[PDB]
């Protein structure tokens, strides 16, 4: 039932992170932990929504 705020915390950290390049590294960290989520990465709507 639903998911803990932990995942969202780290995840949101990426989209919420600054415009710095180092922040991007934080993304790979989350994805590395969430494989089933890696799928959505394929669409990368975020990148196509800039």
């Amino acid at each position: 039932g639903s998911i803990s705020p932990s995942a969202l915390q780290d995840l949101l950290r990426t989209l919420k992170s600054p415009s710095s390049p180092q922040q991007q590294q934080q993304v790979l960290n989350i994805l590395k932990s969430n494989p089933q989520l890696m799928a959505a990465f394929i669409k990368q709507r975020t990148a196509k929504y800039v």
Binding site: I3, K16, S19, T46, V50
Partner: protein
Amino acid sequence: GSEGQSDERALLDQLHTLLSNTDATGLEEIDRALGIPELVNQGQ
């Protein structure tokens, strides 16, 4: 109680609004590093 791509994306979705004004390539850098297609072989 293990899978994601739901709660996180749900909330982060709105926050993504900033990503659209952060850096296009910025998010494309880590992407390629992982491999759009390669990320498809994360099954069983």
